[PDB]
Design a protein around this ligand. Sequence first.
Ligand SMILES: CN(C)c1ccc(/C=C(\C#N)C(=O)N[C@@H]2O[C@H](CO)[C@@H](O)[C@H](O)[C@H]2O)cc1
Ligand SMILES: CN(C)c1ccc(/C=C(\C#N)C(=O)N[C@@H]2O[C@H](CO)[C@@H](O)[C@H](O)[C@H]2O)cc1
Lengths: 808, 808
Amino acid sequence: ISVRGLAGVENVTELKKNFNRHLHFTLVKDRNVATPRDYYFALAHTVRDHLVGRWIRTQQHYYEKDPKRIYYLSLEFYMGRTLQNTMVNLALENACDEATYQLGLDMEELEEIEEDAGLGNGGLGRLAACFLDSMATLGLAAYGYGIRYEFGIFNQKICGGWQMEEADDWLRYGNPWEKARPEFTLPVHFYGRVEHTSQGAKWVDTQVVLAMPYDTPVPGYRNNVVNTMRLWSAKAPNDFNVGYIQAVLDRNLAENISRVLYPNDNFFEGKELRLKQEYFVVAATLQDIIRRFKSSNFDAFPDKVAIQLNDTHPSLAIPELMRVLVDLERLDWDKAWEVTVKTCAYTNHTVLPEALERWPVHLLETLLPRHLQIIYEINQRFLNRVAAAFPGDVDRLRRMSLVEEGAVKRINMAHLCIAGSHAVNGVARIHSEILKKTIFKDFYELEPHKFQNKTNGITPRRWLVLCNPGLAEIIAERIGEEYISDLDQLRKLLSYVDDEAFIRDVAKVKQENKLKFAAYLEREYKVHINPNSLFDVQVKRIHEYKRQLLNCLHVITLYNRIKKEPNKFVVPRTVMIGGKAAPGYHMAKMIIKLITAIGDVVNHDPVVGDRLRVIFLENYRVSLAEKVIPAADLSEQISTAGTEASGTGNMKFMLNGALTIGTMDGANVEMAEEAGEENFFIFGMRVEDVDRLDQRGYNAQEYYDRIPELRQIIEQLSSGFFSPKQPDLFKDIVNMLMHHDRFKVFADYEEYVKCQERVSALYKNPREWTRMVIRNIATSGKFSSDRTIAQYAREIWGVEPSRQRLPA
Amino acid sequence: ISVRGLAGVENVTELKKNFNRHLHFTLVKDRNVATPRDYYFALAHTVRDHLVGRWIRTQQHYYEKDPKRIYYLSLEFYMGRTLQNTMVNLALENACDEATYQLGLDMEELEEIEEDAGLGNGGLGRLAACFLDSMATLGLAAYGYGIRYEFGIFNQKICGGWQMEEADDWLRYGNPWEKARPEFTLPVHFYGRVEHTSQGAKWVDTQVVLAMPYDTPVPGYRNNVVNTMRLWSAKAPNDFNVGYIQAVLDRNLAENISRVLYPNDNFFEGKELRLKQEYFVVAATLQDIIRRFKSSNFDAFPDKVAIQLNDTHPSLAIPELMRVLVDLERLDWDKAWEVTVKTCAYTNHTVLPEALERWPVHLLETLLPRHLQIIYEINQRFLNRVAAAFPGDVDRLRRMSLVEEGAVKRINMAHLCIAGSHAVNGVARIHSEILKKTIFKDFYELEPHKFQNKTNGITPRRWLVLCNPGLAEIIAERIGEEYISDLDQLRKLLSYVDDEAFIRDVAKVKQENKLKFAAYLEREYKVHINPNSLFDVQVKRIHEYKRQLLNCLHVITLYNRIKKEPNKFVVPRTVMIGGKAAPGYHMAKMIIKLITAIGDVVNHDPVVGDRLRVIFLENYRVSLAEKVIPAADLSEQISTAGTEASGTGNMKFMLNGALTIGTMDGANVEMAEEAGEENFFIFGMRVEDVDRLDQRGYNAQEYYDRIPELRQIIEQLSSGFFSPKQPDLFKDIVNMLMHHDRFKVFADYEEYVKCQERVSALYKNPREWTRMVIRNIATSGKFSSDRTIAQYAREIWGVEPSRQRLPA
Ligand SMILES: CN(C)c1ccc(/C=C(\C#N)C(=O)N[C@@H]2O[C@H](CO)[C@@H](O)[C@H](O)[C@H]2O)cc1
Ligand SMILES: CN(C)c1ccc(/C=C(\C#N)C(=O)N[C@@H]2O[C@H](CO)[C@@H](O)[C@H](O)[C@H]2O)cc1
């Protein structure tokens, strides 16, 4: 495979030498005692050595040229594995493959030993990871700042069809990629009280937690640029017998701040420990930013600094920057505010109101008393501007306030972000339009210039070259390698839609990926599947808005049709659903149980045979995405219109040769626009249709009464067909669908089933299926995160990207 | 300095190269950003690389030859710093000095950056460390097993003359010497219950904590032997929203087992967490031992395994070995017991009854229910043997029982150790004799063959070559280098007691050490001392039995004599006292405050001038011992006769050219025997005198009434002379001395003061002082830990030591 790079004689020799050096001196093993894990670590240390010179030279280069620096603040970085990604971006993959082969080792076996860095929940966390790759590839002086969670997203086990959570102890064996920087440790303050002096406000009597940074290299694609991801770890300050012992053990309370990722991406809870995490990353990060700024007045700060807020989770950056500039640097309020607004920009990732951060005032008053005072002052000055622009509009003042009245007074962190940012963006054209028309309509009317769109993207390094080398190679054969850092070049593939050789090659790559994935399932999970079946895949977090339940209704429809006419031909399918449920989300846990319960019936019915299989993919995570997405024929993107801000899984499937069945939601709209609606399986209500249904009121009973196939399914669920031992098991699911369904599952059922029949019809014609796939891959170029980051750079940050290489 | 080794052209070149390699690839720094700490780490990694080949080859050698293995079980390993010790034992010191000098670095400055590994309290912990060095130097297949405490002995700060404790965060910057072995992790069981089956007892429903080993290399002196110290770290097993988050945070409870060293070396407390630490090290260690034994029936176990118990702290080894052999390996009781007794040996380190471990039965019943059943069965069978040997002696049965009756039933762990061991030793001849005559008299009468002496020793690598290279060199000039691994060769120095050159050289080395230490005091602590004064040093943990208070009475006597006759000549003295008090020990904390309070008066009295200085040495630890002991003229070893089991500080001072003022206690007896009583300042009651005084009753008032100089001091203390602001501050000290003094401070006062006058008289004659010093250094050979370990090897473990080198 040419895209995997050169295996030079001298290169392979030096890699074998450095591998043996690390096995002996670093791991303190010989080849007699060494396990596969030791071999993985020797390889990881060998590859890491190639980053170091480029890492030092890149940071030296930024010190000398002093470019504007981009600070990407996120509570989540969903990085996955690093070894293969590093080899790809340094052009070392073939050399390491050869070197390990010559030492009697299978490199693909060693790659499987690495733990995922699971420091995120899903889309928001994975976007941050794709963005770091694109910022390095585009030569931006960019730093990712976050928390080094000791425990990432939980490992999912399925026991009796139920999700169980296990701690993700990802640092158990060590992390060869990070470098502890205990020398750059910074203090973070909590609690205390404000006293007003002659000189101004002073925040006193605080408790201190130390923020210790760990730096991870972020290599650009073959440009010798290595940027930094700096993650903060919480450390206690060093300040009778049981009393002395207990004081040492109580250090754990401070260190708990960085212990564990909150897994509730569905529902904001308002936990004190989460607020501590948010302030911890903000306070440590801003001291680091200001230190770097002063090391080569504050008028130039926005010319040298951009802070990008990944949702409201780091929104305390706005009042913390005001606190430092006013209280410590003694800038006047108006000058500090000008600097803050020009520095900060905010990205929104959902319109669902239960996910929005609204912190109780009493929590902020106790933990961050000076921040609450600054937020009140921001609010008063903001509402003074609203009053002057819309005189007499007293309801607008209530609606736009950063302070929400009620039983419990709360701060709306989204309102704070809009007030304190020069740019607010959604993550797909339809989402950005919904922000301006609905939830932020009042803010758009006051400051229309702030509101932007930045359609999401995915890195084609991880999401094509790394996970699908077969497809990357047959593309490179025709159009060369330049497309890997310029994905718009895939448009050249439209010239090959009638090329019999290319059609055969695209279909062969998919067949190989499906055999490989079918094998993985048998080996690791003792599961057998028909690799000639259509691979129908829905992988994403379990949320009612994502409508895994609509997919379930289709699966039961196909099962019932087969039982009714057993001797009729149907296109064989393997229906695969995977994703984690948030631990407290009862309905999400019941939906996983329904999927496994359907599998229990369908997969053991002798009349069905190998015509229908339903598999729940356990422990969906970045490493499993890299295996299943290249194997997929059909991508399920079936959110209720107006609920999925963008989606990024959708883009991964498009790039890897799956066709999409989807609603006109999030980026699906732009994907259909790029490929042509004739090359997408689009069904269901548009946003306008959902609004009209809400106006007259959604009555699920009407659909149950009018669609006999739907009635039969509800009767089967209610009566215990899928839970014979426990017949009322799914009553909560039935009750939600019939009486309390916010996401209108029944309203899209008929169009979905009809559209799935059209998928089955096209799959019976392999040549026409593959030609439609080529039209999708060829038009996936817009969905490169390189395009997304170039737009952030030019339209928000005010910096020019570069594909110019640094010297090696 | 020849003893520091060769600086070969090729060696210096390769060290400079590997230093620069580690600075770049390991630390990810260049010489522009590097701090002294980075340079320390580059040097440590460079030196560690030289250990690795020898470490792998040593363990391979033990696998091939399959010698009997020695397992030294200790809750404490007081290791201090590793860098200089490693360079000394590999003969790299001059090469590294040259290499660092050529790179523009001062190696002595880099050595000062290393944290002490403070994993012990004092004598018992430091003995374990000296023993590991001697076992490696004598080519024994020896393993030290302990706990990797996250926090060692607290850092001592003195604030307003009071001890404050700070957490010893010794792993803050990382530990380059250890290698995590997460692959050899073992389970340890707690709580649960015993059920009796047809097959026998089963310990079920337990909570599991994981024991993760970290291995540290232990290099022998220039023999290419590198042994292992394996320390266990506690890890939690991987088994709504607040509930999930709280379950992850509760992992801290399991991990608290290895968090912190108990600092109470004075008084046994009976804390559950301490019992968990003791079982944790025993259970993990014994599984490791049995695994290694089975990897090349149990009849051969005592031929292949020796377990040495460092006091009773790992005594649960006895019932744990019985539990594994009976419950898991299904050996009959009598065979298991035979194997256990032949495997285990016990070392006692004190006769003070408050330090003896007596665990409440209710704690053992809850935590270790199967161990309690095995202890009851051991007790019944042991008391059956006592009854058959001494028929009708019902009081002997009560006295010898492992079970102590009372309000709270307790297990006497010393009784368990004697019953379950083939050898019991004290740590100095007088101590071993006291064990047989008093506290273990009944056990000696039943099994006299078990009772041995092993007089303690110190390693001459750390305690001469490393800390006093000047003295090591002038010795090597005369008698060569062989004495460093054969300390009896120092006897050859008796030939030089009348050699004017050697007298001048010994006196010059002491003067240089005193100037160096006087400089350290000014630099680090802004303290000025007269370097021509007699350096009068008492450094050791603060305990009433050690009688720092008797030293205080002498200091006040000298001060009062000077105030009475200001214009009379007295030999100038710097009186230095240092050591940590256990956090709950109120009297020990008051004694530190008295020493600083005396300093406050004496050091600011213009009439005294530079004739008397009283300094409290803050944060006494192994690194400070290495600085102050070479600087000392007079070693204070003034414990009440019968209380100090051995002492080892005494031996360090003797080897480094200080004269000793001491009681006939512990090893002081053997030191005076070796050197001649005419070359020791021996004073005070012998053990026989203490016994006679106890028989008629100690009345402190009698001494107060008869000694006017003593009355004056007590009046000064009581009246507030040393605490003008708070005149009753020392009332508790006065009340203890007058009414409740277990250690008879007043009874030795007159003889102590008279003996101190004889010290002052000899110090006025430099030539005769130095000749007496030469007679001490020349006869210090017996106090090498190489001699001690050779005796353990031949008389307890049944293995022959070897000075034979392994190939490099
Ligand atoms: C702990 N807490 C209260 C949390 C709240 C929210 C979240 C995460 C999301 C939200 N909202 C998220 O991942 N949104 C997705 O962002 C993708 C990238 O822009 C879109 O492609 C996708 O459409 C969004 O759903 C995580 C934690
Ligand atoms: C937590 N706990 C209850 C503890 C109890 C005791 C100890 C330590 C000692 C005792 N006993 C000790 O260090 N004893 C010394 O052993 C030296 C070497 O043999 C002798 O030279 C010296 O004379 C002993 O005092 C530590 C912890």
